[PDB]
Amino acid sequence: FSVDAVRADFPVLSREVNGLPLAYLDSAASAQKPSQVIDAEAEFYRHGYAAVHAGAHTLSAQATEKMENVRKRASLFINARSAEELVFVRGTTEGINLVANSWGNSNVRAGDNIIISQMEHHANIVPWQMLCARVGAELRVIPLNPDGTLQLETLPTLFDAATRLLAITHVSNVLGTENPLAEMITLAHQHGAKVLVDGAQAVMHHPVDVQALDCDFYVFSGHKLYGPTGIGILYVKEALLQEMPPWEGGGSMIATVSLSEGTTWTKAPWRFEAGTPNTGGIIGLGAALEYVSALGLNNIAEYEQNLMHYALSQLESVPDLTLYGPQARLGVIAFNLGAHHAYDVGSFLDNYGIAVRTGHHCAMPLMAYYNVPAMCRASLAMYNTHEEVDRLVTGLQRIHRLLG
Amino acid sequence: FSVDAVRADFPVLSREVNGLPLAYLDSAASAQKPSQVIDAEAEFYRHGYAAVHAGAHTLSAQATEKMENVRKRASLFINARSAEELVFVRGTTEGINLVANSWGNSNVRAGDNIIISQMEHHANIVPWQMLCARVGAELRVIPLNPDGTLQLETLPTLFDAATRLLAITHVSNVLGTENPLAEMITLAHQHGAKVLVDGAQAVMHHPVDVQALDCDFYVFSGHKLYGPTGIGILYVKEALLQEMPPWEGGGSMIATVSLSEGTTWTKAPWRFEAGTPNTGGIIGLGAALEYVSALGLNNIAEYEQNLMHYALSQLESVPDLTLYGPQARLGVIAFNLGAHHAYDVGSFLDNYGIAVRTGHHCAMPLMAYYNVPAMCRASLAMYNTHEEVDRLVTGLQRIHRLLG
Numbered sequence: 022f023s024v025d026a027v028r029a030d031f032p033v034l035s036r037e038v039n040g041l042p043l044a045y046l047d048s049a050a051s052a053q054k055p056s057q058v059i060d061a062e063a064e065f066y067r068h069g070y071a072a073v074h075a076g077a078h079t080l081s082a083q084a085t086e087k088m089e090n091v092r093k094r095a096s097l098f099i100n101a102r103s104a105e106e107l108v109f110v111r112g113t114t115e116g117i118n119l120v121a122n123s124w125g126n127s128n129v130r131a132g133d134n135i136i137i138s139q140m141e142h143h144a145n146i147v148p149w150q151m152l153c154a155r156v157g158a159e160l161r162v163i164p165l166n167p168d169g170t171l172q173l174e175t176l177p178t179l180f181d182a183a184t185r186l187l188a189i190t191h192v193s194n195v196l197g198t199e200n201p202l203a204e205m206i207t208l209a210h211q212h213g214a215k216v217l218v219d220g221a222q223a224v225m226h227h228p229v230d231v232q233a234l235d236c237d238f239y240v241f242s243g244h245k246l247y248g249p250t251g252i253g254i255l256y257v258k259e260a261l262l263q264e265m266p267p268w269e270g271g272g273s274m275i276a277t278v279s280l281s282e283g284t285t286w287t288k289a290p291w292r293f294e295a296g297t298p299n300t301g302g303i304i305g306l307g308a309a310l311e312y313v314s315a316l317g318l319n320n321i322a323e324y325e326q327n328l329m330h331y332a333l334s335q336l337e338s339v340p341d342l343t344l345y346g347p348q349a350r351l352g353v354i355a356f357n358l359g360a361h362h363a364y365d366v367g368s369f370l371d372n373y374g375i376a377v378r379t380g381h382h383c384a385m386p387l388m389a390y391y392n393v394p395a396m397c398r399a400s401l402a403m404y405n406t407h408e409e410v411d412r413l414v415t416g417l418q419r420i421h422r423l424l425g
Numbered sequence: 426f427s428v429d430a431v432r433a434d435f436p437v438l439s440r441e442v443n444g445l446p447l448a449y450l451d452s453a454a455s456a457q458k459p460s461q462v463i464d465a466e467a468e469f470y471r472h473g474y475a476a477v478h479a480g481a482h483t484l485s486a487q488a489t490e491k492m493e494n495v496r497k498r499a500s501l502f503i504n505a506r507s508a509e510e511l512v513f514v515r516g517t518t519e520g521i522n523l524v525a526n527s528w529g530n531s532n533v534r535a536g537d538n539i540i541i542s543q544m545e546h547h548a549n550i551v552p553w554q555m556l557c558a559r560v561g562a563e564l565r566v567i568p569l570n571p572d573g574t575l576q577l578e579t580l581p582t583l584f585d586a587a588t589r590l591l592a593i594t595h596v597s598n599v600l601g602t603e604n605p606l607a608e609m610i611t612l613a614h615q616h617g618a619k620v621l622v623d624g625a626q627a628v629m630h631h632p633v634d635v636q637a638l639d640c641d642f643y644v645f646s647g648h649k650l651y652g653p654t655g656i657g658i659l660y661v662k663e664a665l666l667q668e669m670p671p672w673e674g675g676g677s678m679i680a681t682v683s684l685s686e687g688t689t690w691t692k693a694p695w696r697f698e699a700g701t702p703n704t705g706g707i708i709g710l711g712a713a714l715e716y717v718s719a720l721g722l723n724n725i726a727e728y729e730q731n732l733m734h735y736a737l738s739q740l741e742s743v744p745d746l747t748l749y750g751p752q753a754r755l756g757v758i759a760f761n762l763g764a765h766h767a768y769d770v771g772s773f774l775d776n777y778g779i780a781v782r783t784g785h786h787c788a789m790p791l792m793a794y795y796n797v798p799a800m801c802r803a804s805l806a807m808y809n810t811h812e813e814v815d816r817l818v819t820g821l822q823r824i825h826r827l828l829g
């Protein structure tokens with residue numbers, strides 16, 4: 022793995038944010054895209070665009086073929102049993118919202134309980150709160166530990182006969198923690214409960230095998246996987262998918278439409294994709310899938326791990342720095358400088374040309390646990406360098422001496 | 426207006442489908458995009474991509490500014506009162522599905538009735554059938570006339586005290602008919618009913634003033650307006666929007682999230698946009714809006730009208746040709762050749778390098794009225810020429826002599 026080679030594929034990296042070379046340390050919010058991806062979509066629009074609904078003419082017939090191919094490619098990326106188990110969604114948020122509405126509204130009756138963690142992203146909280154609101158079910162939360170890990174010992178007190186589904190994050194977007202999915206997956210199954218894994222921040226750091234994990238639902242966004250915005254993958258077990266009813270109607274998710282005999286629906290996954298798809302985005306996601314897989318997630322893993330174990334080392338030279346989460350974090354570093362608000366700290370780093378995320382990172386609940394209104398988030402991707410890490414620590418030291 | 430100039434902006438037009446110059450006569454399904462648009466998005470990804478959630482660093486702060494700007498631009502395109510009246514959706518289908526779910530589920534109680542036409546697209550039928558299914562309301566259909574127009578005389582028998590909303594198409598995607606919205610809008614209002622206008626096939630042919638129309642809901646897709654896929658605009662009266670509850674949750678449509686005190690929602694339109702937006706698509710839609718507005722919808726109208734009134738003239742020389750719809754159609758021509766199925770006719774035209782749409786065009790109900798299983802659809806856009814029209818008629822004559 023060679024950063025120099027990689028970074029050469031991302032044009033934005035050669036940018037100058039504030040008269041100073043840009044240091045994009047905020048990929049956890051949204052990764053930058055490589056040329057291969059950017060052009061892959063641009064070419065599609067330039068030499069072969071058309072409607073992807075198995076039309077008559079070659080252009081449309083071919084676009085459809087392209088579309089379906091990406092679906093297969095993605096199916097291999099996460100090792101899905103069959104491509105028909107993958108549904109195209111705008112992103113992780115819509116993905117969960119689809120499951121909650123379709124599968125939730127017909128499996129979680131009033132009285133039952135749903136389990137989610139305390140480190141979950143708002144996209145894996147609200148949709149569930151809404152379900153419980155209308156269905157009349159109870160929402161249970163898995164407590165957290167100071168080191169940013171889950172209080173697993175409290176599992177037996179949460180899992181019971183009325184537990185229907187377990188919505189948990191693969192990796193944390195703030196603490197970088199990687200939950201013990203495998204084991205938790207079986208436990209929830211032992212009680213006959215389903216498990217929805219929100220791996221929006223896992224797919225880009227290392228390999229994922231939905232077959233080995235045995236999860237019933239798995240979602241992730243493309244724009245974070247060095248792909249285009251507006252596209253995401255929703256994976257649901259064939260067995261479960263075939264039984265799920267539609268959520269969005271109209272478009273081409275119907276098999277027949279009669280104003281008298283009523284309308285029928287097609288088979289999954291197409292049943293869950295009404296209206297014209299995001300063809301462009303699909304094409305883009307494919308190139309991203311290809312690009313990343315080319316480098317090897319295991320290689321990207323090794324490099325990213327090294328850079329991290331280095332960033333944590335240097336980050337120690339910084340005084341008054343308070344870190345949140347385990348030492349075995351993933352591509353994310355949540356910290357805070359003494360008593361200064363992340364707003365100001367992050368605002369200063371920007372002046373130095375560093376891109377860091379400040380705020381609650383759509384995880385308000387998690388913040389309340391640490392009694393902090395908000396923290397700073399420095400992400401380390403495959404195109405990031407040690408020099409950038411240094412550029413970060415130094416700036417932190419500077420803002421310390423200046424602000425106090 | 427100069428086609429030669431325009432066509433020079435669309436690279437796909439210089440393509441060769443089947444060894445023969447391509448003749449894209451299927452823009453009604455999805456328009457082709459001009460370079461300005463294709464690059465506008467590509468550049469964004471290349472020199473200034475970032476998360477659009479009012480982040481700290483300049484890149485994200487600026488992306489957000491860009492995003493909101495497009496929203497304003499679009500607000501001016503359809504003459505919305507305020508940009509806060511526009512919601513970003515994947516397309517017309519999701520737009521309607523949003524209204525049906527959010528506004529429908531809380532305004533149409535069991536017993537009430539909803540009115541839709543018989544020429545409506547499946548995207549403006551199914552979502553309503555689903556609402557009536559759960560709410561327990563009654564769905565009423567406005568009969569059609571042989572010339573492909575609405576049987577307005579049957580209006581007083583449909584509109585009553587229990588009529589809540591009127592979902593109608595601005596223009597037909599099969600007949601090219603342009604319904605008398607203005608008048609129908611007032612009638613539905615006189616009874617206190619709302620009106621949702623599906624103008625997915627109107628925005629690109631001529632100007633639209635949601636303020637003059639006084640509709641309460643208006644939707645359209647970008648990919649048909651020479652824009653990128655995966656992006657669309659949903660316009661709803663401020664007054665109504667502010668009262669509508671959320672549909673999709675999580676992301677950034679919340680104001681506060683508490684596992685104990687519960688969560689709250691932000692104000693519209695942001696309240697209806699959970700999760701990371703389709704930033705790329707938004708940027709693209711802007712360029713499209715700009716490109717089209719530059720040429721002048723009124724000019725594009727004049728040219729498109731001429732080409733049509735010419736295509737209809739030549740289309741007469743073709744024997745056994747059966748046309749559907751009025752003589753005052755819009756950018757669309759639905760026909761059929763004698764007794765040959767559109768499949769074969771359209772398949773032959775492709776061999777000649779012509780891109781035409783065959784099937785039911787997601788309007789099964791409309792077909793049943795004409796007792797036809799499917800028809801052919803030739804669309805005439807701003808970049809289409811008389812030579813193409815000729816290339817079409819001639820091919821029709823050929824397939825006639827050959828097939829019979």
Ligand SMILES: *Cc1c(COP(=O)(O)O)cnc(C)c1O
Pocket residue numbers: 272295296297453454515516517518519546548549594596597598623624625626646647649657
């Ligand atoms: C094309 C069309 C739609 C579907 O729009 P999408 O962008 O595919 O969701 C809905 N209604 C009408 C009248 C259309 O022409």
Ligand SMILES: *Cc1c(COP(=O)(O)O)cnc(C)c1O
Pocket residue numbers: 049050111112113114115142144145190192193194219220221222242243245253676699700701
């Ligand atoms: C980023 C993220 C999301 C939101 O995904 P979008 O693509 O913005 O819809 C949800 N869950 C987790 C864990 C995330 O990291």
